[PDB]
């Protein structure tokens, strides 16, 4: 009965811990000690977007690194042109409690979702010229926190799942998490994806088979942000314990911890640069920190925002970094 | 470039005209300890989020319910930091301890320290129950002189209801510090004064915010 279930579960956990310890002799920091430091980086507010009305939760950069999507609590999904600071689209939302938004790689579809437990897919470009509602996925029971497009017909959503746009049905469910899943990221090859829940465990799921390949622990509080490395064999997690962590799928363990004594605020948004050298974490002290992925050093401070930073995104070509916060402002940094 | 500018100005004027009405709507977060009579209140006033629209004295009010959400309320509650008030309902008739703990959690939240809480004691069934073992401090409790019991009410019921009110206020006044205030009320499920009480509390909250804007409070 349950007692020996727990006993062999604990034995399996001990075996996993021993295997992880055996595979680790030297840390990434020791190896990267001998490389040149990144240095102090200065970023200036190139554009500011002030069209929003309430606090802004999520954003997604475009494929062309020029158009972006932003979501705020006023119930408006705003498509922005980052170059000339001219508004491209403004789509009213059925539910004002939108927490996440995604931009399709082809640029023809946009996802939104939130506390309504329903994900809405809109077609940006249509024959008649006005954005309509194209899909309405209402199979989830928990609040939607993150969504990402695999293709024009395949989407992955995070709730606290895989969906086909054509049929609008849940073809794959990713179960195993104990807490509410807050963040989700897509690998460059669109074959695996990591999901972080309201616990120390972050789980990697294969898109096709739909099972949990790997589970990573180490955090001390709820995990809020996750982002794949540009290489695709690693990812970074930002939690509420004022620490950021880097994990890799091949070794299945932690690389280093990015933290400071002066920081006691959780991390809400992480996004790697084009080369992966910068981590670009968003904190609750109204400012973002640029973390060196190899030396665990804060490259720069982005204190332009006045309220809590919720979303941070990096362009596909690594041209500019956009940041939205709990104030109705989106700021672009270089 | 101009072809983009007419669209940009159209979207700008649309956002301005929507902001003209967005600031005229007050958002309220309805919270309760499950079956604490909150649903009866919603039915009296009238799947993830259930929303109710009601206009009082030509002023719109938009209330949000918990809906079909899990018991893990740590995360999504942060989405209601900008609401006008949090109407928190307590079954005053040990669910009382759980309600007190939930009120303590809501009051002391870093993100919810700037929003006010309207405390409702919906279950006024103390007369039926005429409690002392659950709260040892109630045995030595004395009715404060500030109490204003209505005629025709048993003194023990008044003592118990103000004991619960003071038990809530001691947490409320422990770290209020003036940025947010709590407004307890001895209401009932079938009472028609809930709407008026919410109206008055919202007016008081907005007046206090205006005073704080001018540093008069």
């Amino acid at each position: 009965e349950l007692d020996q279930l727990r006993q062999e579960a604990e034995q399996l956990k001990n075996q996993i811990r021993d295997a992880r310890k055996a595979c680790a002799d030297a840390t990434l920091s020791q190896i990267t000690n001998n490389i040149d430091p990144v240095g102090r980086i200065q970023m200036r507010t190139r554009r500011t977007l002030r069209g929003h009305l309430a606090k802004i939760y999520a954003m997604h950069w475009g494929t062309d690194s020029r158009l972006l999507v932003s979501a705020s609590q006023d119930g408006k999904l705003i498509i922005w042109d980052s170059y000339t600071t001219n508004k491209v689209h403004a789509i009213p939302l059925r539910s004002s409690w939108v927490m996440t938004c995604a931009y399709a790689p082809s640029g023809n579809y946009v996802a939104c979702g939130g506390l309504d437990n329903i994900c809405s897919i809109y077609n940006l470009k249509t024959r008649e010229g006005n954005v309509r509602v194209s899909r309405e996925l209402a199979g989830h029971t928990g609040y939607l926190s993150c969504c990402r497009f695999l293709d024009d017909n395949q989407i992955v959503t995070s709730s606290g799942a895989l969906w086909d746009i054509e049929t609008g049905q849940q073809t794959t469910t990713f179960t195993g998490h104990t807490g509410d899943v807050m963040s989700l990221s897509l690998a460059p090859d669109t074959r695996l994806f990591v999901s972080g829940a309201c616990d120390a465990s972050a789980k990697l799921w294969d898109v096709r088979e739909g099972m949990c390949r790997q589970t990573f622990t180490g955090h001390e509080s709820d995990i809020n942000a996750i982002c794949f490395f540009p290489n695709g064999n690693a990812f970074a997690t930002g939690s509420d314990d004022a620490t950021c962590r880097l994990f890799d799928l091949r070794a299945d363990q932690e690389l280093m911890t990015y933290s400071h004594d002066n920081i006691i605020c959780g991390i809400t948004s992480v996004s790697f640069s084009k080369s992966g050298r910068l981590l670009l974490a968003g904190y609750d002290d109204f400012n973002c920190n640029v973390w060196d992925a190899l030396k665990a050093d804060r490259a720069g401070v982005l204190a332009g925002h006045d309220n809590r930073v919720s979303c941070l995104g990096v362009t596909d070509d690594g041209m500019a970094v956009a940041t939205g916060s709990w104030d109705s402002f989106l700021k672009i940094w270089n | 470039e101009k072809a983009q500018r007419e669209a940009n100005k159209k979207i700008e004027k649309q956002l301005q005209k929507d902001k003209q009405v967005y600031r005229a709507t007050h958002r309220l977060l309805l919270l309760g300890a499950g079956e604490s009579g909150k649903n009866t209140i919603v039915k009296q006033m009238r799947s993830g989020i259930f929303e109710t629209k009601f206009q009082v004295d030509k002023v719109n009010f938009h209330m949000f319910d918990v809906g079909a959400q899990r018991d893990e309320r740590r995360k999504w509650i942060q989405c209601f930091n900008d609401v006008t008030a949090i109407i928190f309902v307590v079954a005053s008739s040990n669910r009382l301890q759980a309600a007190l703990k939930l009120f303590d959690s809501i009051w002391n939240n870093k993100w919810l320290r700037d929003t006010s809480v309207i405390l409702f004691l919906n279950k006024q069934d103390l007369l039926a129950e005429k409690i002392e073992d659950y709260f040892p401090e109630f045995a030595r409790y004395t009715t404060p002189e500030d109490a204003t019991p209505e005629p025709g009410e048993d003194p023990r019921v008044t003592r118990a209801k103000y004991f619960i009110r003071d038990e809530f206020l001691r947490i409320s006044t422990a770290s209020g510090d003036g940025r947010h205030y709590c407004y307890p009320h001895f209401t009932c499920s079938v009472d028609t004064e809930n709407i008026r009480r919410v109206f008055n509390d919202c007016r008081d909250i907005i007046q206090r915010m205006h005073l704080r804007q001018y540093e008069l409070l």
Partner: nanobody, 126 residues
Framework: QVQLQESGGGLVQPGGSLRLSCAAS????????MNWVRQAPGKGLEWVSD????????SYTGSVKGRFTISRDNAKNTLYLQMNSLKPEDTAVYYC?????????????????????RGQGTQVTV
């Protein structure tokens, strides 16, 4: 990873005394407020007591006020709970819980079901 282990308990006569221990692993003891919560058979989880990070703020539920006491030791990363003058009403499974967020003077979802930061818990009967 985060893990909480409860030790002690057992079968004691009514009106006796027993001491329960909670051991924490995977996080700093001093950075989180800690809780004891009981769940009676056939009933839901009921909060018992809370202790702050430094132990300055300590409170108990009214049901066991004046009988049960709680203390914490950060150096040993352990929490102690002493029970005196036991009652048949206090027959329940006990769980040592950690507040989800550090450096926060409050915490949510302590008594919520399927809580991640909760220990295995021990049955105490009289």
């Amino acid at each position: 990873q985060v893990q909480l282990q409860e030790s002690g308990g057992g079968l004691v006569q009514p009106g006796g005394s027993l001491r329960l221990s909670c051991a924490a692993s995977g996080f700093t003891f001093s950075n989180y407020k800690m809780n004891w919560v009981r769940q009676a058979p056939g009933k839901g989880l009921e909060w018992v007591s809370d202790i702050s990070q430094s132990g300055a703020s300590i409170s108990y539920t009214g049901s066991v006020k004046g009988r049960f006491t709680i203390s914490r030791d950060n150096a040993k990363n352990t929490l102690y709970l002493q029970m005196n003058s036991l009652k048949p009403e206090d027959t329940a499974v006990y769980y040592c819980a950690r507040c989800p967020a550090p450096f926060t003077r409050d915490c949510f979802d302590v008594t919520s079901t399927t809580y991640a930061y909760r220990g295995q818990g021990t049955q105490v009967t009289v």
